[PDB]
Amino acid sequence: VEAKSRIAVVGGGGSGSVAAWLLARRHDVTLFEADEYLGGHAYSHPVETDQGTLHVDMGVEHFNEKLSPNLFRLLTDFGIGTYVAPSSVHVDFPGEQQSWNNLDFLGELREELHEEFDRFHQEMNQLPTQMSIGEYLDKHGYSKSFKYKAMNPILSIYSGCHAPSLDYNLMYVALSFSMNLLSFFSAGYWRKAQGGIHSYLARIESDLGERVRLNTPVEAVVPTQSGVTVLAGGQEHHFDQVVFATHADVTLRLLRTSDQQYRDLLGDFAYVPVESVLHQDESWLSPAGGGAYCQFRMPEGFELARAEEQMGSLTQNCNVLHPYRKVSSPILITFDPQEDVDPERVIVRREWKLPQLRPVDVRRKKRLHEIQGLNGLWFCGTDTSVTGHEGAIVSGMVIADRLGVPHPFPDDAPAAAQFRGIKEFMGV
Amino acid sequence: VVEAKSRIAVVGGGGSGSVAAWLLARRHDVTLFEADEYLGGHAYSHPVETDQGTLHVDMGVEHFNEKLSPNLFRLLTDFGIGTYVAPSSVHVDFPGEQQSWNNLDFLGELREELHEEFDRFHQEMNQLPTSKQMSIGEYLDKHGYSKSFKYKAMNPILSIYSGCHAPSLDYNLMYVALSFSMNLLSFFSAGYWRKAQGGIHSYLARIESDLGERVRLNTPVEAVVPTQSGVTVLAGGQEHHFDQVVFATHADVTLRLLRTSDQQYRDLLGDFAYVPVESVLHQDESWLSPAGGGAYCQFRMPEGFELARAEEQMGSLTQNCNVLHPYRKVSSPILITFDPQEDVDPERVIVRREWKLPQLRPVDVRRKKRLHEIQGLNGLWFCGTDTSVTGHEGAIVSGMVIADRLGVPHPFPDDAPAAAQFRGIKEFMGV
Ligand SMILES: Cc1cc2nc3c(=O)[nH]c(=O)nc-3n(C[C@H](O)[C@H](O)[C@H](O)COP(=O)(O)OP(=O)(O)OC[C@H]3O[C@@H](n4cnc5c(N)ncnc54)[C@H](O)[C@@H]3O)c2cc1C
Ligand SMILES: Cc1cc2nc3c(=O)[nH]c(=O)nc-3n(C[C@H](O)[C@H](O)[C@H](O)COP(=O)(O)OP(=O)(O)OC[C@H]3O[C@@H](n4cnc5c(N)ncnc54)[C@H](O)[C@@H]3O)c2cc1C
Ligand SMILES: CC(=O)O[C@@H](CC[C@H](C)CC[C@H](O)CC[C@H](C)CCNC(=O)[C@H](C)O)C[C@H]1O[C@H](O)[C@@H](C)C(=O)[C@@H]1C
Ligand SMILES: CC(=O)O[C@@H](CC[C@H](C)CC[C@H](O)CC[C@H](C)CCNC(=O)[C@H](C)O)C[C@H]1O[C@H](O)[C@@H](C)C(=O)[C@@H]1C
Ligand SMILES: [Ca+2]
Ligand SMILES: [Ca+2]
Ligand SMILES: [Ca+2]
């Protein structure tokens, strides 16, 4: 594609913001964002404490230098620091001492499932040497108690508490175990961005300037003989190319083509609802947990026989975070609370949706290469890529590279490799 | 050209020797000479009498995992030996008030003081291999780390591998870098390690059983003299004749036993450096830290520590075996103190072992690789820690590399990570 083209990026989440940021180096870019900030799932909400204002990540928060080399380099290039926020996990079920945790060997669920936690690490480490985690567990003789009291809870930390996590791709889970992201024996190795995840997006927003249109949801995207027409904010805008950084769900709604292969490729993408509640109600902390960053509680009334229908809640104790250590205010995040959180203690709520990561869903992502470039249209974002923020931002980069702007970090071996892998995965 | 049914002696019955002999015996008439009363060397499990049974407590070698040690793991699996996760939780204590850090939680004044440095270090060790023939100390100096980090954090955590007498800050950087990137050592989590069920001695017990009368226990070799006919082994007041002789002893021992006019041997073997280690199996609970909660490894630096005299001062490392998951019902205290400064109450001491470890300075690695020049000459072969990558996998795989060269192929070719490790160690050894 020809230089100085008029390009629109639709959706200002991580993939869109990074796509736009790089595209603007060669093209006349405009970034449309439905909401009042750049970042989407990457949102840091200001909380007022006894130490000043903290920007508390409510969605996206975790990455590391190995898993997310491009995001890491981006942060580093921007002067943004990071810190280690280990994924310590405590799981509570109804009963007396019906728990296990990441940090120690205490709890009755640990006594009950000790052998299984052990074998699972071994097997996940031996695995990399296309099924679901559940199929694997069934097939390799793991107890139903392990599936629903250990596996499903630990996976909800990724997938949300409404997610059919046991149907998600095994390699996703195997890799997380072998890379020390999830573990039944130690707190996993993760980092957070200093000043919250929003910090890198703040800089992208500053760099893009008036090219960014906030609170401007795109209503329709209509390719024509002359170009592509974007209906947003009660006006009509004209472009040569349009980059989609929105979810497949949204993209289909916004897309206005006679072509019905679009309905085929974009319809049928499956999602999971997630509610993130930022609150100060300490009653959500476990009396046995407390110390653990991630605290999963399964409510009273759980039955193994009907486990498939029941769901818990996940609470994050932000006070455990090193930079929050002098803060005397409780800072808590409950994802998918079953009971209502005391609204006199609630700071803010966010409602989002995540993709399902079943092996069929992975096939569905890859197939999007068929419509890539057609009718002056491009696609990036989580639904075109590997899961996680690196996958998201790198998809944006893959599109920018295809549209003239090369991968910005070629001398960074792991960053370049990730770009190459994601470009291959996208079929671009 | 070496051929089948040769008379081969393996000198030294530690891990490398026992595995070398075990595989060699498939093709050759093998004899295994061992100085001590058991097969295993640094791999020693001592029986301890408790109210829930007699436990075989590893005093030396204890840790490995399925990724780091694929050949040993497969060997254990083939023998029907189970393993269990024994995470490397570490607690460090220095003389003041709450002058500690640990890798389970963010408590302690040393954590407060050095938290940011721990953090940067992880980042940098993870970024290192994707880019440096310095030592860990040179790195630390050069990348602006405080002296307090070098001696209150790095040196103590490194003693878990190296021993408390070790100049660990002189050891190769990539050794440390890899340990941090592979979650073996960490300032943020307990590292991923396994132990063998029934102790490490279990796999050796089986090798010993399989070898039978080919094993000569309590038979230290006095001299190894190559002749025009073959090689002569002087051991136990007798003279034994062999076609080939496989050395599985430390380089210093090898040079002492080795008897030739050739002085390239003196050049290649004479400059190997070691560190003494004393392992004390006891029941004196006064050695546990009052703050060092559930930590497996507990390092204590005695009163009188001075940062200026850090180079010459040394702590002690205590292992709390009662924290091990299979030892959870044991009411008896089971403890191992490495290099105790003060004497352990001898009315509470079960047994002591005295060993020596190699130094792993960048020069020492160069020295190991160099041993390819004498490999095969005068019917002589060399395996063991001083010819290989450090650790038990490196040790047992060196034994395998020699067995492969002498006709018996690597036993696990269809195990991709086991085969890869063999290939790497064979390349490193230059065999
Ligand atoms: C609660 C939660 C926690 C998470 N935690 C992590 C984590 O710790 N680590 C990690 O790696 N990943 C995490 N993720 C995954 C996350 O989805 C990805 O990391 C990444 O943020 C998704 O990138 P995206 O740009 O494709 O999606 P989004 O961030 O969802 O971006 C889509 C954007 O499109 C906008 N949009 C919608 N409609 C329109 C319209 N009509 N016109 C214009 N714009 C529109 C939206 O407002 C939004 O800004 C989390 C997700 C959730 C929901
Ligand atoms: C305290 C301690 C703890 C350790 N812990 C671990 C751990 O957890 N994990 C790990 O991977 N590694 C560990 N190691 C490292 C250890 O060096 C290797 O794992 C491995 O045991 C070395 O095996 P080797 O056969 O090369 O040497 P050694 O085990 O030292 O064996 C050499 C053998 O030669 C014999 N010998 C000596 N002189 C003569 C002679 N004249 N004639 C015949 N035989 C002789 C000795 O008795 C001995 O059995 C530890 C070492 C020590 C000292
Ligand atoms: C390295 C890289 O980018 O590639 C791998 C992806 C490994 C994942 C990205 C690791 C998971 C996320 O980064 C972490 C997501 C986050 C912590 C979940 C939601 N977070 C919260 O709720 C926080 C903890 O509060 C490849 C996998 O991606 C595919 O989507 C997946 C289904 C696979 O099959 C591949 C193995
Ligand atoms: C690939 C491989 O197998 O080896 C790598 C090094 C990683 C080590 C082998 C890990 C160290 C040991 O296996 C474990 C040491 C052990 C815990 C010793 C002491 N233990 C105790 O004293 C108590 C009982 O726990 C590569 C490095 O090996 C070399 O020896 C080293 C000097 C290097 O620089 C290489 C990079
Ligand atoms: Ca406080
Ligand atoms: Ca203080
Ligand atoms: Ca010292």
UniProtKB/TrEMBL annotation, chain B:
FAD binds at S16, E34, H42, V61, E62, H63, V221, H250, T385, H392. It comes from Streptomyces rochei (Streptomyces parvullus). The keyword Nucleotide-binding applies. Ca(2+) 2 binds at I160. This is Amine oxidase LkcE. Keywords: Calcium, FAD, Flavoprotein, Metal-binding, Nucleotide-binding, Plasmid. InterPro entries: Amino_oxidase (IPR002937), FAD/NAD-bd_sf (IPR036188), Zeta_carotene_desat/Oxidored (IPR050464). PANTHER family: AMINE OXIDASE DOMAIN-CONTAINING PROTEIN, PROTOPORPHYRINOGEN OXIDASE. One of its GO terms (molecular function) is oxidoreductase activity. Residues 19-287 form the Amine oxidase domain. Ca(2+) 1 binds at E109, E112.
